[PDB]
DNA sequence: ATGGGACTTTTTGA
DNA sequence: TTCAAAAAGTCCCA
């Protein structure tokens, strides 16, 4: 979890580069999760040069005996650097590092606190705040602790929110008037549904100076997280425009230049501005070309998928190894075919059509009692009885030990519907003809009856799989890792759709693609030509 | 050994 | 009663 030095230097320089040390020689710089002091040790170096370069001006303007170069080390540690961390071994190491910057005279007091930053009663605000807070999601966070966050941090922490939301809140709350904060956190709060309250909190309490979005790039080696750097202030400012630096190529190595600023100004990043006053509850962080593109589509389309469709998440068995068998597995001979459903994974979804299924789900909810079908329970499902019994609804009695945890409603699956993978590099919406069941890695919707005469499944997969809609969706989608976006209903169902003079031709092209994709000898190339023709029709329709 | 690519479970709050 | 969100993802190889 060590933050790379090139990022640490940038965040520290972002806050202190324009500090007027003559006007205020007592700046308070805080790291609320300082660890071993990746940031604070750099703050010390930057402060020391700042004081030494102006030592004679300070000696003249202020106590001429206090301001000597020999006194800078003590002054920094007594009045300027503040750290907090829950790990006492980390604080003990940082205290030793800060002491070793000078190399007892008299007992220098360092402002390091071993505590929970979210619980500490903070006695004063701070001029500058930097660091890299902990990230802990809803599954890994201790349940007794979550009761505390839901009580005391409800303005940013609810439901499936993350712990680092609370650090944004704490950092903002203890930032002095006119102060500057700069942190590196996961990027997901910029787009996620859970981050809505946090985005409202940031926008309405600080001026966001700058957002560095690394998208799917791997900033932390051997860590599966996607990062951003937020810089914000509480200055009295009227313009309130955000500098947004979005990475262009996710495969870039971060150390190509001596400094991060060189990387940002390079061709490896795009820069654009966003008006903070124009931010809705969603933050549309795109350049002017993309904003025009996005707005054209939004205004043109009179419907959304949510308007015309019923959406639902897939089956959640609660223990897949207990209920999912290969269709060639001999144990399926014990299971009556009335209990067996086709099962697909996200990899089975292509554009327009689903691979033939290779797995079967035992829809165990339809097993009436333990004595009629003893063989299935003893020889297939019962091999995982202990794990099945530990599921939440089994411990509370709502589920029998052999039942599916969230079996949903079979009738929603056993119908013509559209399916798409929950995480993908591109739009892949397929028409399911085979009553496929799936887990939560595949989402489904079917068309409401009253919209069937306006929209057909064949038309919908045509436009949703188009190049236009792939770009259109990815503008506001949640970037997860390198070449992975979330395709979840909370954004997929917000996709807006249109219907105009090109409807018949778009639908016809979609059927030709479906027909070719289902044939034995597939000449995939003609599909690409048809898709290009369809994309041109869609661009003609939307005026782009 | 590492960094990069394929692929994606069930726990959980509401 | 029962929905859907959540990557400090997870796992493997060359
Ligand atoms: N794998 C992880 N990676 C991220 C590392 S974060 C970097 C620094 O952040 C400090 N740090 C964290 N949480 C703090 C905090 N309050 C929140 C407390 C939340 C909590 C509640 C119950 C049980 C445990 C934690 N207050 C001040 N410092 C804090 C670390 O000690 C570290 O040196 N975190 C999970 C896990 C492991 C480290 C101990 C606890 C987190
Ligand atoms: K003086
Ligand atoms: K990443
Ligand atoms: K992992």
Closest nucleotide (C1' vs CA) to A324 is B9
A431 CA → ligand 4 middle, Å: 33
Give the residue whose CA is nearest to atom 21 of ligand 1.
A145
C1’ C5 / CA A441, Å: 12
Q: Is A186 helix (H, G, I), strand (E, B) or coil?
A: strand
| SS3 letters across A380-420 | CHHHHHHHHHCCHHHHCCCCCCCCCCECCCHHHHCCCEEEE
Atom of ligand 1 minimally distant from the CA of A133: 6
**CB within 8 A of A342, min separation 6: which ones?**
A357, A359, A360, A361, A434, A435, A436, A437
DSSP three-state, residue A24: coil
What is the C-alpha separation between A180 and A127, in angstroms, rounded? 7
CA-closest candidate to residue A466, choices A379, A533, A400, A411:
A533
Query: Would you report the helix, strand and coil content of chain A in percent, each value rounded to 5?
Result: 40, 20, 40
CB A30 within 8 A of CB A43: no
Q: Quote the tokens at residue A184.
A: 């590196």
A188: helix, strand or coil = helix
Which residues of A115-249 form beta strands (DSSP E)?
A: 126-131, 175-186, 207-213, 227-233, 241-247
- CATH code for the domain defined by A1-132: 3.40.50.150
Distance A36 CA to ligand 4 centre (A): 24
CA of A224 to the centre of ligand 4 (A): 7
Distance CA A197, CA A203 (A): 10
What does the domain layout of chain A look like in residue ranges? 1-132, 307-542
Compute the distance between CA of residue A373 and CA of residue A364 in angstroms, rounded to an integer: 10
Which pair of structure tokens corresponds to residue A285? Answer: 């962080």
Which residue has a Cα nearest atom 40 of ligand 1? A86
Give the integer Cα–Cα distance in Å for A536 and A506: 10
Strand partners, A359: A326, A343
Structure tokens at A389: 């019994």
* Token output for A360: 């079967």
By the 10 Å C-beta count (0-12 exposed, 13-18 middle, 19+ buried), A453 is classed as exposed
Contact positions of strand C to protein Cβ (< 7 A): 1-11
Protein residues with beta carbon less than 7 Å from any atom of strand B: A 138-139, 143, 146, 150, 158-160, 218, 221-222, 251, 253, 316-321, 345-347, 390-393, 405-406, 421-424, 439-441, 480-482, 484
Which of A79, A65, A67, A78 has the alpha carbon at shortest distance from A105?
A: A78
What's this structure's resolution in Å? 2.7
- Method in brief: X-ray
Separation of A251 CA and B4 C1' (Å): 10
On whether the CB atoms of residues A316 and A405 are closer than 8 A, the answer is: yes
Specify whether the CB–CB gap between A317 and A404 falls below 8 A: yes
Long-range CB pairs of A517-526 (<8 Å, 24+ gap) are A517/A350, A517/A352, A517/A353, A518/A353
At A536, list the tokens: 């041109």
**Cβ contacts of residue A32 below 8 Å, gap of 6+?**
A84, A117, A129, A131, A133, A167, A170, A171
**Distance (Å, rounded) from C-alpha A522 to C-alpha A526?**
9
Residue with CA nearest C1' of nucleotide B6: A347
DSSP code of A349? B
How far away, in angstroms, is A24 Cα from ligand 2 center?
Answer: 15
Residue A489 makes CB contacts below 8 A (sequence gap 6+) with A311, A313, A443, A445
Instruction: Indicate the pairing of strand A81-85 with strand A29-31.
Output: parallel
């Amino acid at each position: 979890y060590y933050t790379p030095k090139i990022i640490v230097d940038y965040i520290v320089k972002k806050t202190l580069k324009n500090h007027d040390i003559i006007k205020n020689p007592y700046p308070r710089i805080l790291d609320i999760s300082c660890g071993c002091g990746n940031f604070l040790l750099e703050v010390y170096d930057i402060l020391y040069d700042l004081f030494e370069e102006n030592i004679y001006e300070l000696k003249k303007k202020y106590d001429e005996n206090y301001w000597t170069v020999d006194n800078i080390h003590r002054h920094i540690l007594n009045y300027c650097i503040y750290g907090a961390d829950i790990d006492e071994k980390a604080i003990s190491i940082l205290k030793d590092s800060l002491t070793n910057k000078k190399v007892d005279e008299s007992d220098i007091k360092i402002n390091l606190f071993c505590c929970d930053s979210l619980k500490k009663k903070w006695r004063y605000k701070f001029d500058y705040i930097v660091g890299n807070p902990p990230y802990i999601g809803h599954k890994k966070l201790e349940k007794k602790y979550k009761k505390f966050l839901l009580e005391k941090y409800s303005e940013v922490y609810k439901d499936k929110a993350d712990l680092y939301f609370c650090f944004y809140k704490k950092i903002i709350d203890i930032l002095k008037q006119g102060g500057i904060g700069s942190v590196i956190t996961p990027r997901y709060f910029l787009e996620s549904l859970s981050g809505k309250d946090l985005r409202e909190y940031i926008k309405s309490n600080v001026n966001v100076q700058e957002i560095v979005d690394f998208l799917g790039a791997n900033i932390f080696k051997n860590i599966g997280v996607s990062s951003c750097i937020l810089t914000f202030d509480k200055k009295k400012t009227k313009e309130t425009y955000i500098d947004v630096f979005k990475i262009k190529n996710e495969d870039i190595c971060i150390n190509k230049f001596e400094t991060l600023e060189e990387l940002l100004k390079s061709s490896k990043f795009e820069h654009f501005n966003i008006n903070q006053r124009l931010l809705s509850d969603e933050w549309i962080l795109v350049n002017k070309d993309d904003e025009t593109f996005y707005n054209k589509i939004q205004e043109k389309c009179k419907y959304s998928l949510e308007d015309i469709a019923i959406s639902f998440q897939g089956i959640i068995t609660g223990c897949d190894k207990a209920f999912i068998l290969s269709k060639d597995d001999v144990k399926l001979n014990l299971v009556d075919d009335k209990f067996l459903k086709c099962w697909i994974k996200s990899k089975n979804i292509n554009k327009y059509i689903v691979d033939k299924s290779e797995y079967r789900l035992i829809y165990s909810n339809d097993i009436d009692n333990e004595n009629t079908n003893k063989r299935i329970l003893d020889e297939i499902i019962g091999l995982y009885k202990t794990k099945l019994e530990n599921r939440r609804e089994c411990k509370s009695g709502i589920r029998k030990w052999y039942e599916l945890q969230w079996g949903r409603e079979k009738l929603f699956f056993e119908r013509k519907k559209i399916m798409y993978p929950y995480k993908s590099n591109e739009n892949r919406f397929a028409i399911d003809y085979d009553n496929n069941f799936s887990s939560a890695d595949v989402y489904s919707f079917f068309i409401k009856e009253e919209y069937l005469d306006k929209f057909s499944y064949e038309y919908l997969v045509g436009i949703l799989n188009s190049s236009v809609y792939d770009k259109y969706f990815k503008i506001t989608a949640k970037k997860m890792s390198k070449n992975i976006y979330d395709y979840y209903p909370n954004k997929v169902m917000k996709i807006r759709i249109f219907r105009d003079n090109n409807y018949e031709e778009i639908e016809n092209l979609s059927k030709q693609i479906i027909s070719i994709l289902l044939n034995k000898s597939i000449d995939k190339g003609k599909v690409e030509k048809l898709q290009i023709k369809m994309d041109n029709l869609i661009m003609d329709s939307l005026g782009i």
